[PDB]
Structures are given as C-alpha cells and as structure tokens.
Design a protein around this ligand. Structure first.
Ligand code: CA
Ligand code: CA
Length: 127
C-alpha cells in the first residue's frame, strides 16, 4: 500500500517529467488472487483534453516495478504553481469489472525549476 515515484521539473523546456518507480504490497485483486496493475497520471484542475497520461500495465504480480517516465509537454511555470500532480493506481482484470488500488496528490507548486525530488508515501482510500 505504498508508492514510490520521482518527479523532475525542467524550466529550460518547461517540461514536467514524472517517474513512477514502483508499488509495494498490493492487496487481493482478482477472485483468483492474481493482479494486473497500471498507473495513470492526471493533472487537476485542468482540461480533460489530454491532461491525462497512462502508464504501462504489468500482469500477474503483487509488487511490480514500473520505472516509467511520463512526460507532460506544454506546461508553464504558471501551471506548475496552479496545478496538482495526481498519481492514480488502478487494477485491470478480465472483460468484466475493475478495482481502484490507490492514488496520490501533490501540488506542483512544490516543484522547483530544474529540481528532481523522490517520493515514497502510503496511498489513502478513495470514494
Ligand atoms: Ca480485480
Ligand atoms: Ca487484476
């Protein structure tokens, strides 16, 4: 129930780069006891236009490592101090239903130009 991700805010190109490292301890998912988790980055408040990027999806696991770098091009310092970077972790099964694992929330304002910070926190409930 923990998530590790690294964020890099570059000013030269005003590129918001997010690196989701790995998830730790995944609670039961499929009635079978298997699991296929994937990460989804969403910036809010913003235009659902395309402010959402999907991460790779790993299968049959309980503690998978994504180590994926999601980049958001078109962001400006004004947005960095106005938007919030959210990391949504969901679980995908068969052509039936799905179950949300956990998500994170951080105010981009906390990101410094040309700075790289590593995160590691526990996910909270979600209704
Ligand atoms: Ca499931
Ligand atoms: Ca699954």
């Amino acid at each position: 129930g923990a998530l590790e991700f690294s964020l890099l805010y570059d000013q030269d190109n005003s590129n918001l780069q997010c690196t989701i490292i790995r998830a730790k301890g995944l609670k039961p998912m499929d009635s079978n006891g298997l699991a296929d988790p994937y990460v989804k980055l969403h910036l809010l408040p913003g235009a659902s236009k395309s402010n959402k990027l999907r991460t790779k999806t790993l299968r049959n696991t309980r503690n998978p490592v994504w180590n994926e770098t999601l980049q958001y091009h078109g962001i400006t310092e004004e947005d960095m101090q106005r938007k919030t970077l959210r990391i949504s972790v969901c679980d995908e099964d068969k052509f039936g239903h799905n179950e949300f694992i956990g998500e994170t929330r951080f105010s981009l304002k906390k990101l410094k130009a040309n700075q790289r910070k590593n995160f590691n926190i526990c996910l909270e409930r979600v209704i």
